[PDB]
From Swiss-Prot, chains A, B:
The chain holds residues 3264 to 3569 of 7096 of the full protein. It is found in: Host cytoplasm; Host Golgi apparatus; Host nucleus. Changing residue 132 to H: In strain: Omicron/BA.1, Omicron/BA.2, Omicron/BA.2.12.1, Omicron/BA.2.75, Omicron/BA.4, Omicron/BA.5, Omicron/BQ.1.1, Omicron/XBB.1.5, Omicron/EG.5.1. Residues 1-306 form the Peptidase C30 domain. Changing residue 145 to A: Complete loss of 3C-like proteinase nsp5 cleavage. 3CL-PRO exists as monomer and homodimer. Only the homodimer shows catalytic activity. Interacts with host FBXO22; this interaction promotes the proteasomal degradation of nsp5. Residues 1-306 are cytoplasmic. Changing residue 205 to V: In strain: Zeta/P.2. It catalyses: TSAVLQ-|-SGFRK-NH2 and SGVTFQ-|-GKFKK the two peptides corresponding to the two self-cleavage sites of the SARS 3C-like proteinase are the two most reactive peptide substrates. The enzyme exhibits a strong preference for substrates containing Gln at P1 position and Leu at P2 position. There is a cross-link at residues 5, 90 (Glycyl lysine isopeptide (Lys-Gly) (interchain with G-Cter in ubiquitin)). The active site is at residues 41, 145. It comes from the Viruses. Cleaves the C-terminus of replicase polyprotein at 11 sites. Recognizes substrates containing the core sequence [ILMVF]-Q-|-[SGACN]. Cleaves and inactivates human TRMT1, preventing tRNA guanine(26)-dimethylation of tRNAs. May cleave human NLRP1 in lung epithelial cells, thereby activating the NLRP1 inflammasome pathway. May cleave human GSDMD, triggering alternative GSDME-mediated epithelial cell death upon activation of the NLRP1 inflammasome, which may enhance the release interleukins 1B, 6, 16 and 18. Also able to bind an ADP-ribose-1''-phosphate (ADRP). This is 3C-like proteinase nsp5.
Length: 306, 306
């Protein structure tokens, strides 16, 4: 038992982290086979970042302008190209630690592990959700750009996120590994801002089920509600709509606990309207929305990776 | 910026996790050099666990009674011995992935990363604190025994915890890697229970400093307090005493924020007496005590590992 904001074991990703230097800018790259992926803004000077023409900026670069450090071993860059907002640095060595991997783009509301990295050196790992507004509430300091987010299914690393920037509210924006930003963010120095977020309702419900599985039951009730009536409450508390597909996805957790999804919705409704009256759920005094139903099943049933 | 309950990158530990089977019991072992460490209760049957004489139980075992699975490669056990509550299985192969490591015993209030494991396969990683009552609020399912807790300093893994059991409140008890339990727990089936816990005051203060560093300032005030007057409040809210050494340890965070430690204590005092009035700190509506000052400095300054 117990419930922790659990990340995937990071080893498979640690073996792909490299340091990419261009000019005075050092950031992280992801070394898979003979390509190193990194944020294209690595090529930018401070003033470049004001209004960069990346095609212009990149045509003025050479392979030798990119230093790739894989631990204490330099990789020779033999090609460079831009794919959307990522750079692809072709190197003369295939990473012998390349895991089986996929480049997947995730949905807001889904979770992933982040291996926060500095100078190509992994610093820590933690679990994030993609917010409905396509930001992530990460933990990133200067030099963290190019750190990647990922999930692991058995032995395959699904890379879904690479860090590009911190928005003014302290939240983070980045791309998938094809270089396409999550959300309406750009890798230049605009006044861009996160914009309004919502709470991930299906995840809160999942987490309430995790709570029940772990013996927190005080928020349960005999009440039930209809999906429409719940969604009327969800909307008022800035929760996103619950769909029938969310209900279906919660089926296994509902079956395991014997609490009908709509009964849990009634509990959530009460929690939203009454708050928690000084009590806690799974050690939180807030409704937690960064665990998916999958995360709950994984942690309250016990799947591993290899 | 941002603040996440961050674990160390787990790769170095992942390479040490093996599966140990004895009889029908399968659990995790830690494979370092040519020794596999695992909970000694691996040798126990269900009825053995009632009142086990481990010396008797172990003398009746042979090397061939221990199957060690390192991934999909079996390790040949060539020796076994008991060290307190851990078994040391000597195997004929030194783990080629053995990191530089130490066996350290931590203090209540200190934190570590847990690589939760099943059948020798790492499942997830998360950050724990050793509670004042020597339990940890982990996330462990059946088969997690032998999963280890650790910290990483540059390239050296300091193993500090190996999981042995879940107590009735859903918290977890285990040993250091010399096999000595943390706290007054035993690897047998008694009615043992966690016993009373306290909140780790210096950690809460550290986390308040992390909050300030991250722009949460609403809980600040011009007030100050004396250490004795703060500790009078701490005691009443079941917080553990703040020592001058804690104050000293908070020095760097105090210098970085310009908030005197005793001023932060005054803020904590107000938070304890008034609660938080619907506001949050670093995304929590509770005072968080599982970040040490070190964890805060590490995450709000940016140290890596290699
Ligand atoms: C990564 N090493 C670092 N981030 C950057 O260098 C990004 C890159 C350049 C500037 N930048 C920012 O994150 C900035 N944000 C913005 O300009 C924004 F508000 F998002 F529009 C700063 C650092 C000024 C907040 C790009 C926008 C392409 C970095 C990443 N994460 C956290 C950090 F503290 C630093
Ligand atoms: C690990 N694979 C599993 N834990 C055990 O097998 C421990 C070992 C045997 C029984 N045990 C327990 O954790 C039990 N606890 C107690 O007897 C206690 F309350 F602590 F006294 C059970 C599982 C009945 C709660 C030892 C006590 C030596 C395990 C570990 N962590 C979580 C799990 F769900 C299971």
């Amino acid at each position: 038992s117990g419930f922790r904001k659990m990340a995937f074991p990071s080893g498979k990703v640690e073996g792909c982290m490299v340091q990419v230097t261009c000019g005075t800018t050092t950031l992280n790259g992801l070394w898979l086979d003979d390509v190193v992926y990194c944020p294209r803004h690595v090529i930018c000077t401070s003033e470049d970042m004001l209004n960069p023409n990346y095609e212009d900026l990149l045509i003025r670069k050479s392979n030798h302008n990119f230093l790739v450090q894989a631990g204490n071993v330099q990789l020779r860059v033999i090609g460079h190209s831009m794919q959307n907002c990522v750079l692809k640095l072709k190197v003369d060595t295939a990473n012998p630690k390349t895991p089986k991997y996929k480049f997947v783009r995730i949905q807001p509301g889904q979770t992933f592990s982040v291996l926060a990295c500095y100078n190509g050196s992994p610093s820590g790992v933690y679990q994030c959700a993609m917010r409905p507004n396509f930001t992530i509430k990460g933990s990133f300091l200067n030099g963290s750009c190019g750190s990647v987010g990922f999930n692991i299914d058995y032995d395959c690393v699904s890379f879904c996120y690479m860090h590009h920037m911190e928005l003014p509210t302290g939240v983070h924006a980045g791309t998938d590994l094809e270089g396409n930003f999550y959300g309406p963010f750009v890798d230049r120095q605009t006044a861009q801002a996160a914009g309004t977020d919502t709470t991930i309702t299906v995840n809160v419900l999942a987490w309430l089920y995790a709570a029940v599985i772990n013996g927190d039951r005080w928020f349960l009730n005999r009440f039930t509600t209809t999906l429409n009536d719940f969604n009327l409450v969800a909307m008022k508390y800035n929760y996103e709509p619950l769909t029938q597909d969310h209900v279906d996805i919660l089926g296994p957790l509902s079956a395991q606990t014997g609490i009908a999804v709509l009964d849990m919705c009634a509990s959530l409704k009460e929690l939203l309207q009454n708050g928690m009256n000084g009590r806690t759920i799974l050690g939180s005094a807030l409704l937690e929305d960064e665990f998916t139903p999958f995360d709950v099943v994984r942690q309250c049933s016990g799947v591993t990776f290899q």
